[PDB]
Curated annotation (Swiss-Prot), chains A, B:
Its main location: membrane. This is A-type ATP synthase subunit E. It comes from the Archaea. One of its GO terms (biological process) is proton motive force-driven plasma membrane ATP synthesis. It comes from Pyrococcus horikoshii (strain ATCC 700860 / DSM 12428 / JCM 9974 / NBRC 100139 / OT-3). Keywords: ATP synthesis, Cell membrane, Hydrogen ion transport, Ion transport, Membrane, Transport. It is found in: Cell membrane. Component of the A-type ATP synthase that produces ATP from ADP in the presence of a proton gradient across the membrane. It is a peripheral membrane protein.
């Protein structure tokens, strides 16, 4: 499967990624989700390492997004990225790497179409 | 490797591809190479299946590509696509799927980068 094969490359890259570079991913995907939801109180779910980073570096996050209050939620089985929901649990944006790769599957197929047909 | 992985998906697509669809790939990649070389006479190398199709459908090739003169060359071990050479062998365009995938590697990495960093 093409999704799983490209996620293997994401896995390889995470193998040597620094905490600081990974946190740039966390911040970017947090901001995207938080901005689309456009609410002042959200809950964030991710793997244990990621939630720990968000907790440790909350002030860095609030400087690039001052309106939001984050509460950590339950830890999940993800390679990385974040799931962000409203405090009440009504709306949820899945910004895990797994979900994001699925959503960008069309870009991979477009490249393959380029290879085959120009 | 990322190139080998995406080529596995190309291989899977070729497992069921009709002759007519594959020949659309052949024509497109021949057209591109012949345009860049800007020569009247060329030599084409590919797997036996592809060279066979070019030989049997030469009239269709000329209808779309114009007044080209193609000579079949030796077979090469490729998944598909074409290698196109000037008659004297001086200049060679590698339009095999293997070579093309390497050349479009950047587009795959851009999709991966988007998954990670937005």
């Amino acid at each position: 499967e093409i999704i799983s094969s490209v996620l293997e490359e994401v896995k390889r890259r995470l193998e040597t990624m620094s905490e600081d570079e990974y946190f740039e991913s966390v911040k970017a995907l947090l901001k995207e989700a938080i901005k689309e939801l456009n609410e002042k109180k959200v809950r964030v779910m991710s793997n244990e390492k990621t939630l720990g980073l968000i907790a440790s570096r909350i002030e860095e996050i609030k400087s690039e997004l001052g309106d939001v209050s984050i509460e950590l939620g339950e830890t999940v089985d993800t390679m990385g990225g974040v799931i962000v929901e409203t405090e009440d649990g009504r709306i949820r944006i899945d910004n895990t790497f797994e979900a994001r790769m699925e959503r960008f599957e069309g870009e991979i197929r477009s490249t393959i179409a380029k290879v085959l047909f120009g």
